[PDB]
Design a protein around this ligand. Structure first.
Ligand SMILES: CO[C@@](NC(=O)[C@H](C(=O)O)c1ccc(O)cc1)(C(=O)O)[C@@H]1NC(C(=O)O)=C(CSc2nnnn2C)CO1
Ligand SMILES: CO[C@@](NC(=O)[C@H](C(=O)O)c1ccc(O)cc1)(C(=O)O)[C@@H]1NC(C(=O)O)=C(CSc2nnnn2C)CO1
Ligand SMILES: CO[C@@](NC(=O)[C@H](C(=O)O)c1ccc(O)cc1)(C(=O)O)[C@@H]1NC(C(=O)O)=C(CSc2nnnn2C)CO1
Ligand SMILES: CO[C@@](NC(=O)[C@H](C(=O)O)c1ccc(O)cc1)(C(=O)O)[C@@H]1NC(C(=O)O)=C(CSc2nnnn2C)CO1
Ligand SMILES: [Zn+2]
Ligand SMILES: [Zn+2]
Ligand SMILES: [Zn+2]
Ligand SMILES: [Zn+2]
Ligand SMILES: [Zn+2]
Ligand SMILES: [Zn+2]
Ligand SMILES: [Zn+2]
Ligand SMILES: [Zn+2]
Lengths: 264, 264, 264, 264
């Protein structure tokens, strides 16, 4: 009776479906797959990437950056929503091949440094290559690259290091306030009395209110379905996108229903 | 045409076949599986573990340590042959549950710190949970635990951090010199002109001579077949075990044959 | 005109004045100096150390542990108030010589990992030897060693990783609730509009309320004067010690006065 | 009788004497101080810095890079001779302010990661802010930036991670082979029977032969006096510079004399 074999982290086929860059605003492009968000922001002094997707998406991200006229050495900074394998997957490889720096808060930094292993809820099941954070950022800290200011908003819950990123772009000269908010889901998490996260419920609740108050004209999420984006349809991709209030309210109704079933 | 799914590191069934502790010498026990070596050394001041096997072997190692009357908090030190997933697999988990320290040279430390990712030859294919080395040891340095002195002998090749560990035990009061030598194989490695390892051939050759000169009355290897051990047969397990000279000579004949075919 | 020389972190003479172990409760001893707290908790399964003081206090701590009959290999765990040089100074050296593990939250972990350098307020002026955290702990998480449960309470402010530690001891069989609360001072900090800490004032205020609600029969602080301890007088050391309310209220009155002068 | 105060690492005044960039070859400039080498290599794709000097030299290095028309974000890579405080001092700060990556071997990486603390010979006496290596390089590995190839040559001794860097530049179109060799000194080291470095003498001897065989038309050293440079005299700075043979032979005669006095 041999011990079990290791099990690969395997996701939906659409999470790994490459797509050509889809323009969000004047400087902002979606360059990930159909169902995983990877945002490229092009400035006069370099490029900023927010999330990278799965581990095996590293080559596709660089191919899309080339299509945008962004050489590898032009990627200055990597920002993250949270350091799970399906959002921070290729960060280690991207650092080696681009010379970019990574900016994260302490919680995302320690999780990223151990490649997602020893997860509070998933154990060692979703491990990925580790990377180091070069800059630690605090709640409300501004990160400026090429004139574009990125403000971090901590929203703990899905991970302790979960972070929303806001910045103002333009739509043909007219300013548009973009908010890239992290996941508000708890897929199979023990919510009440979790010895690895004793104040988990207080963090989620406080984060629901955080997402509501975000300065937002256009919302995006790591999983585009969470905010009702549809990257595959091109132009009408943002047609049915939720507001910040709708997104945090829908997430909280699922949180409470899950919290109530957990007591049952 | 979606990008490929991740692939799990899957090994032979016998590498994951648990076995009861097999006594090597008065203080030395094999507590791994049939085809993967994990050596436990019991002293008056604590226990020393050399290698741990696969990632999923952590529970079995602790079960065997209990059978030997070794509580988790009695494991003082973890030593490694090399930091590949099939030898350093459970080190991270074992540190959390035992309070042990890990001693390795700088090369094994940096590879262990990134969980085997970015391997010189295997890329990110054999990743495992990362761990940190608490003590860096130099070539020829002695590590003493409970009166038992462990001398490290660097033998780079299979990995840059590959290490042989020697110590003197007893066999009913009569001293027996044990040498635990690391792998001398190069499974699918590019040997000549490897941009990630330009002096690889000089390291292997120098390591063949290193293994020959080791003070050794009884030889063990991470893979027991390399030194012709057979853990499954219990008593006669060491019956056909190779000497140090036989082991390094057989490995070098395979190295040269492989080096010659590589030029062809 | 040569560039300036490096400047050593030099403290009051009394911060470096060794003292013999002073008993706080049945299992709890002060083993630091007259003006720097280092708490030793002796259990049936090992010892716990809370804070270590200055970098150069490592030998004195081990000398005092011996006086208590605690060998180096009996130190199981190191807990911290915050990772400044005058409280986490000897942690790196203590890990090497005792085999202890270190438990801290993510913020204290990242600061401890870079030896206090790049401090939010002090720059590189108070650097000390770096150490790694072996276990990351969350707010409200319980750490049990030898039956004694240690609960962490995050109180950000003096550092982002600032932590209060509570545990129940006994005083000749009668239980006594001990709270070791971290510093609530801001010596020379920019409080309002700090680009390295935009929500600093919200953290301090929330931490003042945290210290008030702590389950506490006897309060201790990293600097004993903050809670009106006097380690030098032996028996009457805790005679004039403040309550939790008195300590947080005195700290907040100094915070507000400082905040008001900062606007002036 | 209080414990001693901490002691600052204080060096000769000339080690901290700023100077204007001194041209070595077409692409290579000395931008450090009079007695500490910091080499800037300007390419079409960015800049390479070899060594940085003391911790407090970070601002001066950036001032000199500006004089050369090199903005902070143009610094692509930092290479090191060895990770002592007087050569790797400002590396941490330079990474934060330039976005450069650092390339070092495993030994220099682990020492740099702990800020020079726990030195094999100097203990914690010469600590500096820690930094992380982004790329691990092997002996003989080539690092190419902007067409300029940098080959590493390991020369252990002064530190285990000591490294010589060679590259071909031009002198008005005519190629000039530059070798930047690390220190070959052992100031106060225990040479024979050093428990922290049992094979120290074998490393130095092998390194003396390594420095002799280096492809070199013009030699430089971290301390310019070691190779008889005189940065202060401008034009005639390289007038009396030693060859590689003269440098390794003079170092070995001092090594043997020191080794012989150590036995006395
Ligand atoms: C780790 O990545 C997530 N989970 C998974 O991939 C798998 C899971 O947990 O099921 C999983 C976990 C552990 C394994 O060993 C294997 C698989 C996660 O973080 O929860 C990902 N991330 C998010 C998020 O970020 O919100 C959602 C959104 S919910 C959703 N998305 N599609 N359907 N649903 C209901 C869940 O999937
Ligand atoms: C990483 O672990 C080893 N390789 C493997 O497990 C697999 C491989 O390389 O084939 C592998 C590699 C990458 C993958 O993505 C998937 C699988 C390795 O380090 O080479 C292991 N370790 C040793 C050693 O330590 O010598 C031998 C001994 S040779 C031997 N053993 N049995 N048959 N043979 C001929 C090879 O297997
Ligand atoms: C870093 O350590 C503290 N500061 C200092 O040692 C020095 C300082 O800041 O002045 C300092 C700072 C930077 C330097 O380059 C040199 C020196 C600190 O963390 O603030 C220490 N810790 C606490 C605390 O933990 O609360 C108090 C309590 S206030 C107090 N204590 N005595 N008198 N006062 C008014 C201040 O001292
Ligand atoms: C750490 O930096 C070096 N040593 C020192 O700065 C001091 C020392 O050791 O004396 C020292 C050490 C520890 C302390 O707590 C305080 C000071 C070193 O690495 O040896 C530096 N580096 C080199 C080198 O790199 O070769 C030489 C060249 S020999 C030379 N240079 N000038 N005169 N001499 C004879 C020595 O100085
Ligand atoms: Zn997730
Ligand atoms: Zn996800
Ligand atoms: Zn291997
Ligand atoms: Zn193997
Ligand atoms: Zn402090
Ligand atoms: Zn303090
Ligand atoms: Zn040096
Ligand atoms: Zn030096």
């Amino acid at each position: 009776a041999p011990l079990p074999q290791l099990r690969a982290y395997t996701v939906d086929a659409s999470w790994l479906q490459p797509m050509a860059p889809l323009q969000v605003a004047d400087h902002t492009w979606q360059i990930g797959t159909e169902d995983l968000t990877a945002l490229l922001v092009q400035t006069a002094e370099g490029a900023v990437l927010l999330d990278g997707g799965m581990p095996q998406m590293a080559g596709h991200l660089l191919d899309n950056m080339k299509l945008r006229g962004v050489a590898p050495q032009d990627l200055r900074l990597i920002l993250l929503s949270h350091a799970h394998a399906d959002h921070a997957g290729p960060v280690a490889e991207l650092k080696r091949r681009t010379g970019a720096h990574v900016a994260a808060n302490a919680e995302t930094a320690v999780l990223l440094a151990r490649g997602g292993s020893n997860d509070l809820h998933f154990g060692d099941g979703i491990t990925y290559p580790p990377a180091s954070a070069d800059r630690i950022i605090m709640d409300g800290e501004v990160v400026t690259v090429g004139g574009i200011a990125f403000t971090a908003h901590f929203m703990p819950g899905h991970t302790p290091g979960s972070t929303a990123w806001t910045w103002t772009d333009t739509r043909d000269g007219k300013p548009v306030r973009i908010a890239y908010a992290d996941s508000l889901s708890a897929p199979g998490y023990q919510l009440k009395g979790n010895p690895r996260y004793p104040r988990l419920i207080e963090d989620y609740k406080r984060s629901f209110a955080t997402v509501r108050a975000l300065p937002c004209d256009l919302l995006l999420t790591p999983h585009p379905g969470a905010s009702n984006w549809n990257y595959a349809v091109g132009s009408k991709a943002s047609a049915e996108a939720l507001t910040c209030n709708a997104y945090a309210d829908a997430a909280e109704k699922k949180f409470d229903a899950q919290l109530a079933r957990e007591t049952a």
